[PDB]
Amino acid sequence: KVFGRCELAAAMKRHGLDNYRGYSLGNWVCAAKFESNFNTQATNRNTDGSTDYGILQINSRWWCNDGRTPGSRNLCNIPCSALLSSDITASVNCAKKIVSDGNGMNAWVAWRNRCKGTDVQAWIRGCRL
Ligand SMILES: [Pt+2]
Ligand SMILES: [Pt+2]
Ligand SMILES: [Pt+2]
């Protein structure tokens, strides 16, 4: 599913991401834009052999099992395919564990390099939140 901007804002809001660990909804929407372009089906294979999955490009080294990432943990106790669903619940539950691990949203290098310190409120403009 390729989400609309406001559509993904609403879904992220219902699932408890607005101000989660202090991050306003716009930060989550900006991150999703530059990680996946709002596509729940996005996958990206890393040179280390891990893969990034779904709307927030969650990585198989630590967070999910894909059956092909060597010496990997599965700290979110899900199959990585759960992260490609049109239903974002599994990705949001995983994103909460990741953002809680100590580096906040710096865990998403696209957030650090393209969203951090910018006017991220622009990403929720117009949306009925
Ligand atoms: Pt939803
Ligand atoms: Pt939820
Ligand atoms: Pt856009």
CB 64 within 8 A of CB 78: yes
CA quadruple 33, 28, 105, 79: dihedral sign: negative
Nearest to 51 by CA among 65, 40, 37: 65
Separation of alpha carbons 49 and 51, rounded Å:
7
Q: Say if residue 101 carries a ligand binding annotation.
A: yes
User: The tokens of 101 are what?
Assistant: 């691990």
Tell me which of 7, 35, 66, 119 is the catalytic residue.
Answer: 35
Count: domains in the chain: 1
Considering the candidates 52, 66, 87, 119, report the single residue annotated as catalytic. 52
What does the alpha-carbon distance between residue 83 and residue 98 come to, in Å, rounded to a whole number? 14
Q: CATH number of the domain at 123, please.
A: 1.10.530.10
- The per-type count for the chain, helices as H runs and strands as E runs, is 4, 3
Contact between 32 and 55 (Cβ < 8 Å):
yes
Distance 86 CA to ligand 3 centre (A): 19
DSSP codes, 56-112: TTEETTTS-B-S--TT---TT-SBGGGGGSSS-HHHHHHHHHHHTSSSGGGGSHHHH
Q: How would you class 25 by CB atoms within 10 Å of its CB: exposed for 0-12, middle for 13-18, buried for 19 or more?
A: buried
Q: How far is CA 1 from CA 5, 72, 78, in A?
A: 12, 27, 20
Contact present, 72 and 62 (Cβ < 8 Å): yes
Give the C-alpha distances (Å, rounded to integers) separating 35 from 20, 62, 100. Answer: 19, 18, 19
Q: Is the dihedral of CA 126, 85, 1, 99 positive or negative?
A: positive
d(CA 115, CA 17): 16
For residue 58, what are the domain limits?
1-129
**How far is Cα 9 from Cα 7, in angstroms, rounded to an integer?**
6
Which residues are bridge partners to 105 per DSSP?
Answer: none
H/E stretch holding 38: none
Tokens read off for 89? 């619940």
- Technique used by the depositors: X-ray
**50 CA to middle of ligand 2, Å?**
26
